[PDB]
Design a protein around this ligand. Sequence first.
Ligand SMILES: [Zn+2]
Ligand SMILES: [Zn+2]
Lengths: 339, 114, 40, 107, 20, 52, 33, 10, 101, 208, 32, 171, 345, 197
Amino acid sequence: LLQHKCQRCKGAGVMTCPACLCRVCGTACAWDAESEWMERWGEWESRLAYYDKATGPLMDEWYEDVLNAGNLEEDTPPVEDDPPGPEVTGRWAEHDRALHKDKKRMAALMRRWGHPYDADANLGYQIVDPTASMGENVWNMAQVYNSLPPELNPLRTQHLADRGGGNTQAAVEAARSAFDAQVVMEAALLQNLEAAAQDLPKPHRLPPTAGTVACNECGGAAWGYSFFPNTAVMFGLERPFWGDTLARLSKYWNPTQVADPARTGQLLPYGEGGLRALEAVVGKAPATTGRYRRDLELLLAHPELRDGALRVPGGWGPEGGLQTYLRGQQEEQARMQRR
Amino acid sequence: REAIPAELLLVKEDPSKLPAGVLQTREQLKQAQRDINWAGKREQVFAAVAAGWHLASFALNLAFWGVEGMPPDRYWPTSPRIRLQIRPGRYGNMDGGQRVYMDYLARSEGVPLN
Amino acid sequence: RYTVPFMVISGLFWMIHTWILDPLPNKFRRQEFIRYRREM
Amino acid sequence: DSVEQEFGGDYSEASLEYIRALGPKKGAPFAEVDPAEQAAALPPSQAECEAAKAVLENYKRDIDALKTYRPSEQERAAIDARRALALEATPEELTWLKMREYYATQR
Amino acid sequence: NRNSRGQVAEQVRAILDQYD
Amino acid sequence: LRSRMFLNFLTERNKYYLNSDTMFRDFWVWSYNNTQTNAFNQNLWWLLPNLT
Amino acid sequence: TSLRGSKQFLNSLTILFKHQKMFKKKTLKAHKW
Amino acid sequence: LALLTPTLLT
Amino acid sequence: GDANSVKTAWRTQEVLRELSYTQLWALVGEGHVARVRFYGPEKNKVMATTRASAPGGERLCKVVLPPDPELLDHLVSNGVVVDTGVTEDDRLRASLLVQML
Amino acid sequence: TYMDWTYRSTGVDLSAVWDPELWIRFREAVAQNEPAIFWNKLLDRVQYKENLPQAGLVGDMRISYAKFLELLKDQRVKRLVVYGDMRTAVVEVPHPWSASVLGHPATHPFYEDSAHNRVSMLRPNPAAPEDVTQWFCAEMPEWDMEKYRFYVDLPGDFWESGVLQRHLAAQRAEGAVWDPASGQYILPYRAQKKVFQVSTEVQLLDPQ
Amino acid sequence: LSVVSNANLLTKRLNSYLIYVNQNLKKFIQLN
Amino acid sequence: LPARATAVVAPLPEKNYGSLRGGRWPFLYDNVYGLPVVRQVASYGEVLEGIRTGRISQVLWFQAPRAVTASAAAPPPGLGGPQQPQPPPLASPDGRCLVRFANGQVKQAVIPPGEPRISQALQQYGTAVSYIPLEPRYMPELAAMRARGAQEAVLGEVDTGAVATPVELPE
Amino acid sequence: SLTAERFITDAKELNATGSGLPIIDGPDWEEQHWAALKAMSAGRPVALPTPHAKFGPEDLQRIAASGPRLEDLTLEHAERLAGPGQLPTAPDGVALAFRYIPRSVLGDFRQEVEPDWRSLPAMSPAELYAGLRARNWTSAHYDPAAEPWRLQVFSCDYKHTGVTGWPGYRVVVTSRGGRRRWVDLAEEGELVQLTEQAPPASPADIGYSHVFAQLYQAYEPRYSPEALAALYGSSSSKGKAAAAAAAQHDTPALRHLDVSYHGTGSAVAPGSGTAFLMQPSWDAVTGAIRWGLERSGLPELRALRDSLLPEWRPPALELNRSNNNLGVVYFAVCLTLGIVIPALR
Amino acid sequence: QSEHNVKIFHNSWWTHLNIKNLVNNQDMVFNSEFINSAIIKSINNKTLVENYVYSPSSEKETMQLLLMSSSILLHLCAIISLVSISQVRCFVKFHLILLYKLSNVYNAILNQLSNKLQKNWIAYGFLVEWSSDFITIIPENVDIYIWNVFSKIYRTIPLSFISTTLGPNYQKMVAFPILLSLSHLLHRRILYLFDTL
Ligand SMILES: [Zn+2]
Ligand SMILES: [Zn+2]
């Protein structure tokens, strides 16, 4: 009842930029740079794979299998005997050989990397189990540094405490602080979304961004509590009528001229300057696109990259995804002639 | 050590080529100075007036001070239990309540005994 | 704006001004004695 | 080559490309230490950096101790004029002389 | 239907529970 | 199937290189669970291990 | 040596099921591509 | 406040 | 899989299977919406009844509208029964007892 | 269903609190003996916070107002969810290789032929054969898309400026044009999408 | 519009100078 | 070496150009820096007509430093994180700007950054719009250097007067 | 250009800048002439402001003859990034240099004095709108025989620092005889575009949106009737061969001034004790309490000291809370200590 | 169509956090009060016009007084209606008992320190207090003390109301008895609001 919003910005705290809509706008954000979207999401996905317990019971049974190597309940041996020859061609023979090398390749995987629970790649064994209690899992998460991935875990680089070295207090600490600031800002964004979902004013007044300026009257506060109760929150008269908003927007978008442009001598519309197989057949050209031109050309040049068995990490630059896979294949093909 | 004669340091502005109304008269300068002086103390004066009103109310209460000069009032006794009709009855009162009442009354009177 | 801090100041001052300054009519000692002798 | 020596005993080149195409070995995401930071933390140390960087230190001590003299006394009158300049100056005047030197060497 | 990550976790638990 | 699950996990976690005292525990979990939906829950959060 | 995909990984469930679990026979003629 | 509501809602 | 291999999906079946403003506009322009009913104290939401020729049969879908001044002209010119309702003038008196409740 | 008669009959404007959509869902659930139709809507109304976007919005996912406008003008925005206050939007922008059916191996192989190859539907542009980024491509199904969910703080004159209105008027101005000079109905190239261009889906939220 | 009479020039601080120096040093290092 | 003259000067009469009020300052050069003061003030209509007719070759807006908490390119500094570089400076909210004419004359103006008519003329007629970077004493990156140069010594009578700010080679 | 940053690597210039150029500091830029002008009034000898060392005698003569140019107001400042011994270069201090114009050389001019609003005669927004329409040549109510108006638009800058702030704009209108009135466009009325010419229904909906629309429409250029030879033309680039050599008349420059958009002075600093006394808040009180530090520089964390000083403070308060003379002398001692202790810090 | 389930674990992790002091850049080192200025400005600018009293001169003072009275009365009515619930009274009683025991702990520690520093079970422990009517175990001393504090605070209300309303035929003749009656009724209404609370 005590919340009142600014009447100029309607509780937003930001107005559309006076110029350009620049040196009067805000200072953009970290996620407007489209060139770093896939790198940012790749690092975030790599961080989230530590916490992800979607495959939890499967990795738990794998952990039990590698702990006690004395299992039972087989009850039928799989037949599964057809890796026919190193000869012939096609896709079936290649896929079948790659499927039949599964046991030796899994042994290689378990020798090079081992179980994720034995190397702290995942969260470990049963630490966070649902249906236990909200608070036992909180205690287990607060135990050691289970809330952080090992790339930001302080108990991994303390052995390098002498002279700093690889910047365990300047690079790992900076990365951990940036990660914590990002998750705290995510919580702030979620609180703002929750307040916006129920028509309430947002609690966190964020700085203006690259298309916005601060409000003239608030400066960015956009609302506040007061002794006087809101008579719009009371009596339900908080939101305008749809027809009234339509009439306001129609009158605002349709200015009229009450002077004929012959008595006043005006021959041009308002503004400065005054006197003066594309874009009409196909229509424009994308502007945010253009950094993916090389990847599109390479995907057209090599149709084998469209194979369903191939899954590149993703990216647009020379470093990452299609170009990385093509460079790896070319390096392998060049170095197999010398070996 | 260079000298740099004043003809290369002083402005030779003639108040004749200036446009009309640019040269401020003495009355205009006095009005501008008065406006600057008022704008330099306006918020302070208004805040002082509001705080002075609050201080005048507080000083009136100070001149009231205590109870002297005021008659006893049969419509307003000093106890709200007298003013209303509030008595303890069968439900709620128990023997131990006398002990608790004694301790609360000791603390309210201000003695550290129980 | 100035109502709330001045009201808090006056409330604290009048809370002091019936406990130390202007208490009961110099019968506090008798009250405390009553409290001494009634806790039997 | 580390995968080529460790797994190249009983594995094919298809399996070696399979192992190679999974990133590096167990590093920071696997609670080990990364080779990037490992190569640049402690191995920057040398044998006491050749005795307090003696390749520069002995040369510098030799030339700096050889500089024990006064270089010239014919141009010391400019040094006396400049030591008077350090006293016959407001700090604003000294900054003015500094900008005079900077704009002289700029153009 | 496209499951979120939590719903994928529910699916994995249901599938790894069923027969028992 | 287990090999491809491990392959997916390894490729997901290897993207990091693509840049550029039982009594106290029981008391705390009991108090946190019992005072869950109250303003007196943000005072047990400050009684955990270091967490920094 | 860096992170990249492989055709040996066999990321397609259709490959992993038509090769290992599902074996049926389809009788039709293709119309699209 | 209902007497003041059409005034305040501006 | 397909249902389990997005890693970004969030209520993909609850969002979708639900008319938005652009989808309502497309359905009206295709002549698939039988009736539009404005409801609410602000009349900013409609309960669109689609025809039997619409994709998915005949169903009622709630659409919240932006302040679009061409929407009513679009509905009228595409043969849609635009039913508003009541809209009592005295908003203060009408929205008083229900706010007390 | 609508409770629009309640004020003139009783004095209490129950239409201010009644939910006609929830009544309609309850009626349909009762008629079809399918209680999920009513229960899902009731649970979405009750547990609205748990319906907030928690996937694809990780760690300060704010773009800008200006970038949101640039992405909207480039038709790179798949969904625009405007919240109840009409001042905060969630911008679901697809991952680029998930924006259309291109056959890029980064995406999950949703669409494969019998040769187990990802299906590419990149039709060449006869007006720009040297610029593959100007070529035409069918957009992916939304349910198969991977989308960044950005947070945008809209200004208070967002509806007055009419940028969303201008984008909608640009999007709904073309499609399925009859051509008498050659017969047939022609979908014009202006009505088709480019390689990374998607159809913007504007959905508003009801705070009730 | 929104004109003020005097702009605010905003008249622990070593770190900002260090970031200025390092960032411009990086710009030089990459340039050559 | 520089001059140290001192004389009694009558200040000029206070003007009133409308856009910029005062201006007496009988000296050609100001104190502190010693650069020529821009005594001429260009009105809003004169600036508009100079942009339209091409007589104005450049408009240079002054700048003001932007607050760190006003930067949206990072999480807020209240959250624990890296210190982050300084945000780019704002255009001056007081609207003070220099106008360089085609004949080399420099005038003063108060043009609000974001004015519709002026911004439209500067867009259509291609007059170069620049932003004067900042002062070193007003740059937040050099605030520490300004503070250290103000709160410490400058020479301590150590050598002589020939360098600039020698905290590397002390005094 | 001014915005161009360069890297100095050639020697004999790195010897000029040891660790950076000396930061020229003084008494701000707005108040750098106040003391000199106070000395000059009631005439006393004042120091001559000797010019910068960047230019010589022929440039001093040129400045005295013609006036400043953009080159003469431009100063270069260089800051050293690395010392001698940097591997990419070796003998180069690689210092970063940038050009700038200081916020001086605009000195002592200042924006228009905010008038006494309570004493100036007031003019209605409707009357201001009618006058702006009469001086608008694009409008049907244009009057060529109209007295010139000087419009000065003020926006309040003590809205959050002072107590008498106002939300909108205030237009001081100066007539032909020097008479000044003012208009209070406190709220935006009927929100219209800048090209709207229709007056609104119910004239009390005339806010500053209509006023700014009229101000925009007034300054529209008026063209001679050569459009019959320009909108049709003959051939070629007619807009630059027959239209650009056609000129225009402004029309408001002989009837309007609109000479600036000013801002009011803010005599109260936004973070001062006077502002705290004007608008008190518990956040400001806690900020002042945290500013009351620089006395507890002790190991006062997690063990003793400040875990016991605010517990051993109430026995210096609640025990001395009793009586009157003891409370008065304790209040006097504490007040004197709190007055003298920030004074030293 | 799928059937949903009630989420019961970790439902809104962002809700039970106080991120405000971190986001607004406090503790490292926006402004209100445009609200009341805008409210009183709208009150003055519209004021509803008392044409039934032929648009009197004061007017804005009457509307501002009505706004302040309505706000004060709404807050006090909300508090009285909240404490009129018996479970809310149980809550108040429980908090008062806890504060009494904790005040005893504070008093014990403090006065023991200022005692040695001079010139230098459930029966007793919250059952006979929680189960008894609090009219019984509360001295009339604290009721008299609270009433005396209240009556000392709100003692200058008639004179201050007269000074405000009388500050800057029939003009100040039909006003002074009415303002006198309003001041007296207002003071008695504040006393009776204390009485009903
Ligand atoms: Zn606002
Ligand atoms: Zn801008």
